[PDB]
Design a protein around this ligand. Structure first.
Ligand SMILES: Nc1nc2c(ncn2[C@@H]2O[C@H](COP(=O)(O)OP(=O)(O)O)[C@@H](O)[C@H]2O)c(=O)[nH]1
Ligand SMILES: Nc1ncnc2c1ncn2[C@@H]1O[C@H](COP(=O)(O)OP(=O)(O)O)[C@@H](O)[C@H]1O
Ligand SMILES: Nc1ncnc2c1ncn2[C@@H]1O[C@H](COP(=O)(O)OP(=O)(O)O)[C@@H](O)[C@H]1O
Lengths: 339, 238, 318, 322, 332
């Protein structure tokens, strides 16, 4: 895929957010005094790419010789847990949120093992914002203890769930999403590399706008559009959206058009179809909310009610267990306010 | 014994009856009796109520209240009951909250939409959908494990963004080129350590207009046989 | 008064026909005793519904009055450990005893939910080893905590909370077995306090008889730690919010009653307020449950109870 | 020695309040009998006091050789304290009375497994030892453990008896206590005599001239670490009368300088507002609901300044209803 | 010197170096004069010198050498609750008391007890504090406890009665800015006008957070390498604080009241990565302390901000919560 083929493999290959690239270059100039890093920003903006580029600047190209292994841990009630650890001769990558609430013991055991086995080895923790508070406290303790041999590079989309004690011990780095011009430049480089015919450069601008600052989404959308149009994009080429987004937009049009109990049953069927195929409930709620707010026929009162119900049921989703229970309630509340 | 499977249906039908929610019906069938109906089978009653509360014709509607508003109130209460259930199942000493869960999941939502059953009492579909979601999440986890080295994304990002583009590289060339696209598909699979099982699993994740069951069925059997033969005839990276 | 065995065990039944809770269980146990083919059993449920007594009666109904080696009871959460309990179970199962054809032994695994997956698998292996002469009944808290290989061979008996009619019928046995002077309000109070808990009801009855002999609501609730339901009813039904708050602050909060007891008694009383419309009762129960959840999360203050009363008053006065 | 131990009565004649329990216990001492006993209720009612009084009245000068006192919260847990119980039950003496006595305190603070162990131990040594279980509530215990011992509920002492005991302690210790300090101590300790004695002993130590200085309510509130009523009243007055900027500044300044947590400030303000005469009931409804919501949100964390301004706004908005 | 946090590097050594805490310092000097040292309870605003003063008192009691052996510094905010902290305290107390040297005895009193320090004691639950009181009374012979907390009212009555209480006044802004300026001049940190004031404002007077932020800003300036003065925008970026211009734009969009304009601006804003919690906090600070809004508006907006903050604390979608909050304010 073009999103992976042309991913920057070094700090010099980065093309957007020049100030952040300069900052990362300065960090690699003093490898010994590398602070713990917490990287936050919108999804698909280049956080992981920049982590890997900094690691390559420090240790060399060997960071990309990645190999995957399964480490087995045991907890109090002999419950064998398996965590997938992507490792290199210089660093480790873990996603402790994959273990649920058992992330604390996994983090403790793995970090202690890495510290004992050791100038230092960098550990990249993905989705740090979804770590439990106990896991974050254990992470702070390991930062205090094994700072000599362990340097943490945490990546998250929102810094709010991160506890205050961690924030003080780490260097907060902000990654804004690239502007439309930078996304257009990246897509232009990709299409020139892949020899894709463009009627006009305005096609790239439309792809950038449709992606809403998500560089991964824009690259994948460009690849999908190119394949559909026989490697020749025209000014009339439609923007290709994912299947789940199309389903959610259809659901939004259905909700707006008719508001009844039978419509609610069919919306339940659609939501079951979406949830059964690995579409997260929060993603469904966000897309459904922001599709409803874009309907031109709705007035200000309807949109205000919709956003209020969205906030309420988003809190209920975060505090809940069964996803379909809350999405159906949100849709039922929305139907009442429109009618 | 053999009527145990029919017990949740009877409980759901009785609790959605609008007679027991009028004044006389309330006097004859008190609130204690309804909570006891919940406690007859507390594993399935909330699920049955959540499943069957849209299929009623309400007879307890307040003046000036439509069916949809009562449905919305019942759904709100069902959501609150789900939160209560999550808090109950967390830890173990919270069994004292069982009557509250009863009211919030079974009795109160039924009170808003009680009436005549417009159709048949259907068994809860949440269990099968939950099992299906777990199976597909396991498949997605395996696929992400295989493709983690080549892609820079998480599992959810792989589902949402990468997979729609993988469809245009692993399935679309078959429709337009036939057996001539086997080499390119295999090359794409090799770049991401995708096996034939992973290729089968990927096509199962699509919804709506991107469903691939009929499209794959329409592919000639000779093309599929050649694809699997060519895959089995050459070594692949691991 | 002298040293007496508590009535929770002194007047326990010894025949399945003398047990009123879970009539389906009674019928199935009688049928199995008549047939003589004892299967595996799960009897999990909330504590105090007398599942141990029921299986104890079932053992002596299947067999004769033989108890020395044919019946074994043990606690899976014993301090001696899982291994020691399993060894004792194996010793009892392998111990030879005169058994009538089909009348296998019965082992009661009280608190069987503490057994892990490996321990449960070992218990399944032991049961298969001694299937020709031993059967297992699991008196755990939850049926869902038992693995499928054990459950598939068990006759599932879904023990649930006993109704008030069953509690009254069972307590009538002790009522006729003891020289009890009583009033209707006292028995109503005793049933109210237990709320389907047979052991708690029996214990409260014994405590009332020991303390006062006569069974009337005043003495019963002077024995019982819970707040008096009349006080809670006055607090809930007061037409003026200040009156409700005054009653709370004086009679319940300053009397040392915990917030948990206050909300539990409020929930119990609101369910039985026949003079109030059922929709209003459901609204009040929702508010009481919300404050109960807040209390169980560690807040448990007087302000939460005051807010509960304020919301209930708002509901009542529309 | 702590004043709790120093002023613990040596005989049942000095016990007050629990007339029924005193009469029932005195019957046991008069007959020389000692059955299984369960004392429970609020702390500071005099449970341990009554049991030691009866033990010293029965055994007499050989009190040490007859009884053993235990705490369920000790570092020894449950197995080691059970071993200690067995060791005390195996003690051999040249002469002894009918039964031994073992004191178990804070039994309700143990797991159900520990309660099962206590159940299995209670009847094990009935032939030569008697067990008493002390807790805060009896119904909170498992039912089978409840039935092993006789029920005896303890109720909070009347204020007059507490005042008499406080006066006795004052005259014995030559302490000078202001009446306002007495009211503050009684209100703070809400019937817990142990709290009263501990605070009185600690306040005497903080006096640079204990032989002549007088303990004021300020000293009592400092010792207990409790919010002063004056501070809460000043905050409430500023909220009700002053504008938003002044009220915000006053609340933040007071509760930062005096070290009052926002939840404790809310509790104190709610307690003060109960005595207010409000014409509109909607004022009370809104106040209670909003303040309970804020207090619940504080327990989960959140922004402290936002919660404080929420408290100010909730109080201001409710009083618009007059 | 070697790399070290500036918080630990610039702690006052002896009691005489503690500023703006003359009352607590005098009372502690009087207590030190007496041979017997009671249990201590340090409470006050954060970053006022509680830990600094207790460390200085310990160093005066034991001397620089014997201090490390007689001190167990613990933090009660760590998970696993009572067990770990109480076991560590028990092990420290049961550990044999270190024998002071000849030099230590002749120059320092070297009292026969070992001081145990608990930080953030107010965060403990009631049961944890009761267990701590049990441990304190068990080993009261050889250990003296010092509890450091922000709110004394969060400590239960039985535990608070056993401890003498020392109230630390909040640092005057002049004293805090002078301390920060002295630290910056000692470490050769170039700062523009109002940078230290901005650091203090961000830290809300907390000198610990102010020193940490100043050190982070110095490190960032070293990384930049241009040798120019540190600016306010840099420290705002390091602290995760939304720029004032963006906040003013949000306020103007709310004032205009158009739903579509607000939604578009929030969609654009969520792409910059700024934390929504910081936006809510700064909106609260702007609106509450603003003289251009009447009482009713503030009464409504305080509840709005409280609800939004409560929902944000549950781990929800920042975009939805921020959009709902901004839409609700525009309708006031
Ligand atoms: N050409 C180019 N592509 C980039 C740059 N930054 C990110 N990308 C692309 O964005 C895609 C997703 O970035 P990712 O590592 O997943 O960032 P994250 O998900 O936000 O942590 C990658 O596949 C890259 O190809 C850049 O500076 N230049
Ligand atoms: N009814 C009472 N009459 C006289 N003194 C009492 C009474 N209740 C408590 N006290 C005093 O309180 C002190 C400790 O009470 P204690 O019995 O330890 O409380 P608890 O019941 O929690 O054990 C004793 O020294 C005793 O003098
Ligand atoms: N009174 C003071 N005089 C000098 N520096 C102080 C004072 N109070 C705090 N500090 C500075 O604050 C930093 C640590 O603050 P600390 O005392 O840990 O805060 P807390 O009071 O929350 O314990 C030290 O580096 C110290 O220089």
């Amino acid at each position: 895929l073009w999103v992976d083929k042309y991913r920057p493999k070094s700090l010099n290959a980065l093309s957007h957010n020049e100030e952040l690239t300069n900052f990362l270059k300065s960090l690699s100039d003093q490898p010994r005094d590398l602070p713990h890093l917490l990287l936050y920003g919108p999804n698909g903006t280049g956080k992981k790419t920049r982590c890997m580029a900094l690691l390559e600047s420090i240790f060399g190209p060997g960071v990309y010789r990645l190999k995957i292994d399964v480490r087995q841990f045991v907890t109090a009630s002999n419950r064998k847990l398996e965590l997938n650890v992507v490792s290199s001769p210089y660093h480790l990558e873990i996603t402790p949120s994959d273990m649920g609430n058992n992330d604390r013991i996994v983090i403790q055991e793995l970090l202690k093992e890495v510290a004992q086995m050791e100038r230092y080895k960098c550990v990249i923790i993905n989705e740090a914002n979804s770590l439990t508070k106990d896991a974050q406290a254990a992470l702070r303790r390991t930062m205090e203890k094994y700072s000599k041999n362990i340097r943490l590079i945490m990546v998250c989309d929102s810094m709010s769930p991160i506890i205050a004690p961690i924030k003080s011990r780490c260097l907060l780095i902000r990654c804004p999403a690239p502007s439309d011009s930078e996304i257009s430049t990246i897509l232009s480089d990709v299409v020139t590399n892949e020899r894709i015919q463009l009627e006009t450069k305005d096609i790239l601008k439309r792809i950038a706008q449709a992606s809403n600052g998500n560089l991964r989404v824009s690259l994948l959308m460009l690849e999908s559009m190119a394949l559909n149009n026989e490697l020749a994009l025209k000014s009339s080429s439609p923007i290709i959206k994912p299947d789940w987004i199309i389903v959610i937009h259809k659901l939004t049009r259905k909700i707006v058009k008719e508001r009844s109990v039978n419509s609610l049953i069919e919306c339940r069927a659609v939501l079951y179809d979406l949830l059964a195929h690995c579409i997260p409930a929060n993603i469904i709620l966000k897309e459904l909310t922001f599709s409803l707010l874009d309907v031109e026929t709705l007035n200000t009162t309807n949109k205000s009610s919709i956003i209020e119900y969205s906030s309420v049921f988003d809190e209920r989703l975060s505090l809940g267990n069964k996803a379909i229970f809350h999405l159906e309630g949100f849709i039922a509340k929305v139907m009442c306010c429109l009618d | 014994e053999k009527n145990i499977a029919l017990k949740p249906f009877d409980i759901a039908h009785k609790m959605l009856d609008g007679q027991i929610y009028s004044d006389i019906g309330s006097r004859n069938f008190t609130l204690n009796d309804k909570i006891a109906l919940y406690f007859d089978d507390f594993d399935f009653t909330p699920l049955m109520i959540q499943e069957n509360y849209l299929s009623t014709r309400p007879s307890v509607l307040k003046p000036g209240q439509s069916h949809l508003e009562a449905v919305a109130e019942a759904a709100n209460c069902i959501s609150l009951g789900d939160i209560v259930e999550k808090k109950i199942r967390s830890s173990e000493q919270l069994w004292s909250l069982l009557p509250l869960h009863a009211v919030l999941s079974s009795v109160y939502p039924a009170s808003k939409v009680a009436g005549h059953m417009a159709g048949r009492i259907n068994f809860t579909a949440w269990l099968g959908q939950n099992s299906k979601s777990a199976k597909y999440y396991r498949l997605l986890q395996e696929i992400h494990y295989h493709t983690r080295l080549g892609t820079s994304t998480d599992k959810i990002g792989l589902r949402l963004d990468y997979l729609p583009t993988f469809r245009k590289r692993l399935l679309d060339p078959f429709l337009k080129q036939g057996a001539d696209a086997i080499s390119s598909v295999i090359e794409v699979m090799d770049d991401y350590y995708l096996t034939k099982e992973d290729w089968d699993s990927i096509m199962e994740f699509f919804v709506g207009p991107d469903v691939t069951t009929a499209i794959i069925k329409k592919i000639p059997a000779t093309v599929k046989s050649g694809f699997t033969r060519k895959y089995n005839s050459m070594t692949h990276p691991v | 008064l002298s040293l007496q065995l508590p009535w929770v065990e002194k007047y326990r039944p010894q025949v399945l026909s003398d047990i009123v809770g879970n009539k389906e269980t009674i019928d199935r146990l009688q049928q199995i005793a008549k047939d003589g083919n004892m299967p595996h059993m799960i009897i999990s449920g909330m504590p105090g519904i007398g599942k141990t007594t029921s299986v104890h009666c079932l053992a002596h109904e299947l067999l004769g009055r033989s108890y020395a080696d044919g019946v074994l009871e043990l606690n899976a959460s014993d301090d001696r450990g899982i291994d020691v309990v399993r060894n004792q179970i194996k010793h009892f199962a392998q111990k030879k005893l005169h058994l009538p054809p089909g009348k296998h032994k019965i082992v009661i695994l009280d608190e069987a939910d503490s057994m892990t997956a490996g321990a449960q698998q070992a218990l399944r292996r032991t049961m298969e080893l001694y299937s020709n002469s031993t059967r297992f009944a699991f008196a755990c808290n939850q049926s869902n905590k038992i693995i499928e290989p054990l459950q598939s061979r068990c006759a599932i008996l879904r023990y649930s909370k006993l109704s008030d009619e069953d509690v009254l019928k069972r307590l009538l046995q002790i009522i006729k077995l003891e020289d009890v002077k009583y009033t209707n309000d006292g028995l109503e109070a005793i049933i109210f306090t237990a709320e389907g808990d047979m052991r708690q009801a029996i214990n409260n009855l014994q405590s009332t008889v020991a303390g006062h002999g006569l069974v009337n609501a005043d003495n019963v609730f002077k024995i019982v730690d819970s707040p008096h339901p009349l006080i809670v009813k006055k607090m809930l039904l007061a037409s003026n919010l200040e009156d409700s708050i005054q009653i709370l602050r004086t009679d319940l909060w300053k009397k040392g009653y915990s917030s948990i007891d206050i909300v539990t008694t409020s929930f119990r009383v609101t369910k039985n307020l026949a003079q109030v419309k059922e929709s209003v009762r459901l609204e009040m129960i929702k508010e009481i449950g919300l404050t109960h959840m807040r209390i169980l999360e560690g807040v448990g203050t007087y302000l939460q109870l005051a807010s509960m009363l304020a919301k209930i008053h708002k509901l009542n006065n529309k | 020695l702590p004043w709790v131990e120093k002023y613990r009565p040596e005989t049942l004649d000095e016990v007050y309040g629990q007339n029924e329990v005193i009469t029932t216990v005195r019957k046991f001492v008069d007959e020389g009998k000692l059955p299984h006993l369960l004392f429970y209720g609020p702390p500071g009612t005099g449970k341990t006091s009554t049991i030691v009084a009866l033990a010293r009245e029965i055994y007499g000068k050989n009190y040490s050789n007859m009884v053993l006192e235990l705490n369920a919260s000790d570092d020894r847990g449950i197995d080691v304290v059970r071993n200690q119980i067995k060791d005390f039950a195996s003690t051999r003496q040249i002469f002894s009375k009918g039964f031994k006595l073992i004191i178990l305190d804070e039994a309700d603070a143990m797991t159900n497994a520990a309660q099962n162990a206590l159940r299995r131990v209670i009847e094990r040594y009935t032939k030569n030892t008697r067990f008493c279980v002390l807790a805060n509530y009896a119904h909170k215990l498992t039912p089978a453990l409840l039935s092993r011992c006789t029920r005896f509920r303890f109720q909070p002492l009347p204020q007059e008896a507490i005042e008499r005991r406080i006066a006795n302690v004052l005259v014995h210790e030559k302490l000078k206590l202001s009446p306002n300090a007495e009211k503050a101590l009684i209100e703070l300790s809400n019937g817990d005599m142990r709290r009263v004695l501990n605070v009185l002993q600690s306040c005497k130590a903080t006096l640079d001239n204990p032989d002549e200085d007088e303990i004021s309510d300020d000293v009592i509130y400092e010792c207990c670490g409790a919010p002063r009523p004056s501070d809460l009243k000043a905050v409430l007055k500023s909220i009700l009368e002053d504008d938003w900027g002044t009220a915000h500044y006053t609340l933040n300044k007071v509760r930062s300088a005096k070290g009052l947590a926002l939840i404790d400030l809310i509790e104190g303000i709610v307690k003060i507002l109960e005595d207010y005469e409000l014409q509109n009931e909607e004022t009370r409804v809104h106040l209670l609901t909003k303040l309970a919501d804020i207090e619940y949100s504080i327990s989960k964390g959140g922004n402290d300044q936002i919660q404080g301004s929420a408290v100010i706004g909730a109080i201001k908005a409710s009083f618009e209803n007059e | 010197l070697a790399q070290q946090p500036w918080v630990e590097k610039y702690r006052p050594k002896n009691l005489d170096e503690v500023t703006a805490q003359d009352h607590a310092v005098t009372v502690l000097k009087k207590t030190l004069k007496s041979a017997n040292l009671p249990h201590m309870l340090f409470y006050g605003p954060p970053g006022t010198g509680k830990t600094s003063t207790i460390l200085a008192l310990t160093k005066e009691l034991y001397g620089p050498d014997l201090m490390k052996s007689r001190i167990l510094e613990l933090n009660a905010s760590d998970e696993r609750g009572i067990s770990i902290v109480r076991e560590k305290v028990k092990n420290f107390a049961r550990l044999t008391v270190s024998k002071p040297s000849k030099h230590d005895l002749e120059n320092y009193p070297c009292p026969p007890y070992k001081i145990i320090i608990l930080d953030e004691a107010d965060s403990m639950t009631a049961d944890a504090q009761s267990a701590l009181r049990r441990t304190m009374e068990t080993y009261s012979g050889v250990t003296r406890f010092c509890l450091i907390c922000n709110y004394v009212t969060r400590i239960i009555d039985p535990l608070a009665s056993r401890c003498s209480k020392f109230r630390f006044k909040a640092l005057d802004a002049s004293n805090a800015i002078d301390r920060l300026r002295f630290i910056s001049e000692q470490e050769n940190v170039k700062c523009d006008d109002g940078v230290l004031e901005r650091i203090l404002d961000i830290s809300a007077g907390d000198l610990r957070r102010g020193i940490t932020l100043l050190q982070s800003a110095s490190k960032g300036a070293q990384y930049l390498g241009d040798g120019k003065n540190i600016t306010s925008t840099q420290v705002e970026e390091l602290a995760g604080v939304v720029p004032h211009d963006i906040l003013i734009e949000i306020v103007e969009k709310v004032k205009s009241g158009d739903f579509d304009e607000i939604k578009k601006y929030v969609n654009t804003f969520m792409k910059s990565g700024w934390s929504a919690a910081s936006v809510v906090n700064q909106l609260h600070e702007y609106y509450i302390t603003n003289d251009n809004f009447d009482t009713n508006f503030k009464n409504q907006i305080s509840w709005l901000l409280f609800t939004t903050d409560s929902r944000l604390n549950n781990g929800t979608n920042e975009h939805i919560q921020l959009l709902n909050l901004l839409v609700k304010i525009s309708q006031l």
